C-alpha cells in the first residue's frame, strides 16, 4: 500500500488540513461516538457529552499522531511503534473500530474541505488510513 | 429499522434538498475509484481507466440516478425494508453475485458524498441518523444470502 | 437456513459425535489466542496473557462448553434460528456491544476445530453444509443490529 | 505485520507441509468452491467437477506461490509483485474472497496435521495469510 503517487497526495492533502488537525480529530471522534455506539465502550472514564474537554483534548492527540505519521510514510512501523503497543497489546481495540474512525474522519474532511476532497485525494487518504490502522492493530513483537 | 419521530423529520427534510441528478453519479464514481475491484461488475460502461473518465462517463450518472432513486424509496419505507428491496435482492444475489460487504461500502461513500454537499448542516446527529438508514438498506439487499 | 433434506441428515449425524466440552473449550480458547482483542470481554476470567494460560484456564473451558451447547440448539432448530437466539442476540448486541464480525470469526474457528477432530471424515461437502449453519447462527445473533 | 515469533512459526509449520503444499492447495480450492459458490464466478473457463485435473493443476500453482512467500517473509511486496498485478489489476478480485480461501487453507491444514496445528501455530499462520492477502489486493508499493 502507499505508492509514490499516494504519498504525494497525502502530504499535499494534509497540507490543506494544516493546524485544524486537532479540531478535525475531535469532530471525527464525536461523529464516531454518536454514529457507532459500540465504540463508546473503550472510554468508560470519559465525558462523552457534546463539547467535552476530554474529547476535544483527545481529538488533539489523534490529530498530531496523524500529522506525525504523514511525516514518516517510509517507516510507519517505527514512528508509531509506541501507539501500536498501546492499542493492540494494552488496550486490545477491535480492528473493526479503526474502519469506523477512518470513515468518520474522511466524512469530517469532506465537510470542511469539499473542494480539496477530490475523488483521487479521497482514494489516497483512504489507503493512508488503512495502513495506519494495520500498524496500530499489528502486534509485531 | 427504527428512528425517533424527530429523526425521520430531520432525515427526510435533508433528502428533499438532494440533487438526484448528481449525488447518484458521484457516489457510484467515488465507489469505482476508491475501491477499484467494483469495476468488475461495470465493464459494459466503457472507459473507467482513470478518475477523470469515471466521473465523466454518461452511464455512471445514468445508473447513478437509478441507484440514488431506490435509496429514496428506502428513506421512506423505513419500517418495511425487507419488502421494498426484496426484488433487487434476488437480482444482486442470483444474477450479479455481489458480495454483501459491498453494499456497506457504497452506503458509506453515499454518506461521505452527502457530507461534501451539505457541509456543516450535515451534523454528527444527522450523520448518525443516516448511518442507521444506510445500515438497514444494506441489510435488506442481503436477505437472500443464507 | 434451509438445507437439502440430505444435508440436514449429514449435519445432525456429525453432531451426535461432538463432545461439547472438548470442542467448546478448544474453540473459545483458539478465539482468544488467534484474535487477542476478544480477550477484553473476558478479563474477569483471569490470566489470559499466553496460549498456555488460556488453554489451561478452567473458566475458558467452562464458558466454552456453554457456547457449544448453544450452537447445538441452533443445529436442532435450523428452521427457527431467529427465535432460538433472540435472547442471546439482545445480550451480545444491546448489553455487551460485541461487533457482529466476531460472531463469524467464532463460527469459522469452530469449523476449523471440527476439522481437526474429525479429519478426513470432515469432507469438503460436509463443511460446505456447516458453513451454512454457522453463517446462519451468526446472522441470527446479529439480528438485533437487524 | 509479522513478528519474529510468527516468522519462526510459519517457517516451521510449512516445514511440516513439506511436499504436500500442492495437494493442500487443491483441497483448499475444492473446499472453497463447495463452501462458497460465489467464487466459481471467477473460474468460468474451468471444469469445476470433482477431482478435476484443472483444479489440481491450479491448486499446485497456489501451493508453490505460498512456499515462495514463506521464503520471503521479510519482503512479501517484492516477491509477490507479479501476482499482485494479476489479481488486482487484471482479475479485479473482490478482497473478501481472500478471507474465504485463507479459512479453507487453515481448515485443510487442520485436517491433515492435527497434532502440529496448535493454537500458537494457528494464530501465526493466520497473520501470514492476511499478510499475503494484503499484498495481492493492493495496487501498491
Ligand atoms: C487513526 C487511528 C488512531 C490513532 C492515530 C490513535 C491515536 C491515539 C494516541 C496518540 C493515543 C495516546 C494518547 C495519550 O498518550 O494520552 C491514543 C489513546 C487511546 N486511543 Fe487511540 N488512536 C486511534 C484509534 C483508536 C480507536 C479506533 C480506538 C477505539 C475506539 C482508540 C481508543 C483509544 C483509547 C481508549 C486511548 C486511551 C484514552 C485515555 O485513557 O486517555 N484509538 N490513541
Ligand atoms: C445500496 C446498494 C445498492 C442499491 C440500492 C442498488 C440499486 C440498483 C438498482 C436500482 C439497479 C437497477 C435495476 C433495474 O433498473 O432493474 C441496480 C443494478 C445493478 N447493480 Fe446495484 N445497487 C446497489 C449496490 C450495488 C453494488 C455494490 C454493486 C457493485 C458491485 C452493484 C452492481 C449493479 C449492477 C452491475 C447492476 C446492473 C446494471 C445494468 O447493467 O443495467 N449494485 N442496482
Ligand atoms: C457464535 C457466537 C456465539 C455464541 C453462540 C455465544 C453464546 C453465548 C452464551 C450461550 C453465553 C452464556 C450465557 C449465560 O451463561 O447465561 C454467552 C455469554 C457471553 N458472550 Fe457469547 N457467544 C458467541 C460469541 C461471542 C463473542 C464473539 C464474544 C466476544 C467478543 C462473546 C462474549 C460474551 C460474553 C462477555 C458473555 C458473558 C460471559 C459470562 O459472564 O458468562 N460471545 N455467549
Ligand atoms: C492465497 C492467495 C492466493 C494465491 C497465493 C493465489 C495464487 C495464484 C497463482 C500462483 C496464480 C498464477 C497462475 C500462473 O501464472 O500459472 C493465480 C491465478 C488465478 N487466481 Fe489466484 N491466488 C490466491 C487467491 C485467489 C482468489 C481469492 C481468487 C478468487 C476467488 C483467485 C483467482 C485466480 C484466478 C481466476 C486465476 C487465473 C486462473 C486461470 O485462468 O488460469 N486467486 N492465483
Cβ atoms of residues A29 and A35 within 8 Å: no
Please check whether residue A1 touches D, CB under 8 A.
yes
C-alpha cell, C23: 470442542
- Considering the segment(s) C1-146 as one domain, its CATH architecture is Orthogonal Bundle (1.10)
DSSP H helices, chain A, are 4-17, 21-35, 53-70, 76-79, 81-84, 96-112, 119-137
Q: Give the closest of A34, A117, A123 to B124, CB-based.
A: A34
Task: Please give the distance, rounded to the nearest whole angstrom, from the Cα atom of residue D129 to the centre of ligand 4.
Answer: 14
Question: Using CA atoms, how far apart are residues A50 and B125, in angstroms rounded to an integer?
Answer: 11
Task: Please give the distance, rounded to the nearest whole angstrom, from the Cα atom of residue C40 to the centre of ligand 3.
Answer: 13
Question: Using CA atoms, how far apart are residues B122 and A34, in angstroms rounded to an integer?
Answer: 13
Please name which ligand lies nearest the alpha carbon of D82.
Answer: 4
Cβ atoms of residues D85 and D136 within 8 Å: no
Please check whether residue C133 touches B, CB under 8 A.
no
Question: Which residue reads 432448530 in cell numbers?
Answer: C77
DSSP B39: G
Q: Which residues of B touch A108 (CB under 8 A)?
A: 115
Give the number of other Cβ atoms within 10 Å of residue B91's Cβ.
14
The structure was resolved experimentally with X-ray
Question: Which residue reads 448489553 in cell numbers?
Answer: C95
Question: Using CA atoms, how far apart are residues B16 and D41, in angstroms rounded to an integer?
Answer: 40
Cβ atoms of residues B15 and B72 within 8 Å: yes
Q: Using only the alpha carbons of chain D, give its radius of gyration.
A: 15
Query: What is the homologous superfamily of the domain A1-141 according to CATH?
Result: Globins (1.10.490.10)
The resolution in angstroms reads 2.6
> Quick one: C79 exposed, middle or buried, by C-beta within 10 A (0-12, 13-18, 19+)?
exposed
DSSP B35: S
Cβ atoms of residues D4 and D11 within 8 Å: no
Residue located nearest, by CA, to atom 42 of ligand 1: A87
Annotated binding-site residues of C for heme b read 63, 92
**CA angle (B124 as vertex; B122, B128 as ends), nearest 5:** 100
DSSP H helices, C16-123, are 20-34, 51-56, 58-75, 81-90, 101-118
Task: Please give the distance, rounded to the nearest whole angstrom, from the Cα atom of residue A58 to the centre of ligand 2.
Answer: 40
What separation in angstroms does the CA of D16 have from each of C109, D30, D66, D137? 21, 21, 14, 28
Residues 6+ apart with CB under 8 A from B86: B140, B143
Q: Any idea of the CA torsion for A20, A26, A30, A33, to the nearest 10 degrees?
A: 130
Question: Using CA atoms, how far apart are residues B143 and B129, in angstroms rounded to an integer?
Answer: 22
Domain ranges of chain C: 1-146
Domain ranges of chain D: 1-141
Classify C2 as helix, strand or coil. Answer: coil
Q: Any idea of the CA torsion for A92, A97, A101, A103, to the nearest 10 degrees?
A: 150
Amino acid at each position: 500500500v502507499l505508492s509514490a503517487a499516494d504519498k504525494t497526495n497525502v502530504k499535499a492533502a494534509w497540507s490543506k488540513v494544516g493546524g485544524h488537525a486537532g479540531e478535525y480529530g475531535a469532530e471525527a471522534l464525536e461523529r464516531m461516538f454518536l454514529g457507532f455506539p459500540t465504540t463508546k465502550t473503550y472510554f468508560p472514564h470519559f465525558d462523552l457529552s457534546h463539547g467535552s474537554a476530554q474529547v476535544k483534548a483527545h481529538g488533539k492527540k489523534v490529530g498530531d499522531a496523524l500529522t506525525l505519521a504523514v511525516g514518516h510514510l517510509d517507516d510507519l512501523p517505527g514512528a508509531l511503534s509506541d501507539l501500536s503497543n498501546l492499542h493492540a497489546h494494552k488496550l486490545r481495540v477491535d480492528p473493526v473500530n479503526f474502519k469506523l474512525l477512518s470513515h468518520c474522519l474522511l466524512s469530517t474532511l469532506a465537510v470542511h474541505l469539499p473542494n480539496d476532497f477530490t475523488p483521487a485525494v479521497h482514494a489516497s487518504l483512504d489507503k493512508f488510513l488503512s495502513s495506519v490502522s494495520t500498524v496500530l492493530t499489528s502486534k509485531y513483537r | 429499522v427504527q428512528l425517533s419521530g424527530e429523526e425521520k423529520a430531520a432525515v427526510l427534510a435533508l433528502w428533499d434538498k438532494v440533487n438526484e441528478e448528481e449525488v447518484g453519479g458521484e457516489a457510484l464514481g467515488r465507489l469505482l475509484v476508491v475501491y477499484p475491484w467494483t469495476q468488475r461488475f461495470f465493464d459494459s460502461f466503457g472507459d473507467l481507466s482513470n478518475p477523470g473518465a469515471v466521473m465523466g462517463n454518461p452511464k455512471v450518472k445514468a445508473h447513478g440516478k437509478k441507484v440514488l432513486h431506490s435509496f429514496g424509496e428506502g428513506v421512506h419505507h423505513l419500517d418495511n425494508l425487507k419488502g421494498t428491496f426484496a426484488a433487487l435482492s434476488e437480482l444482486h444475489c442470483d444474477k450479479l453475485h455481489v458480495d454483501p460487504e459491498n453494499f456497506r461500502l457504497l452506503g458509506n461513500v453515499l454518506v461521505v458524498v452527502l457530507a461534501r454537499h451539505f457541509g456543516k448542516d450535515f451534523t454528527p446527529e444527522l450523520q448518525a441518523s443516516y448511518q442507521k438508514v444506510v445500515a438497514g438498506v444494506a441489510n435488506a439487499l442481503a436477505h437472500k444470502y443464507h
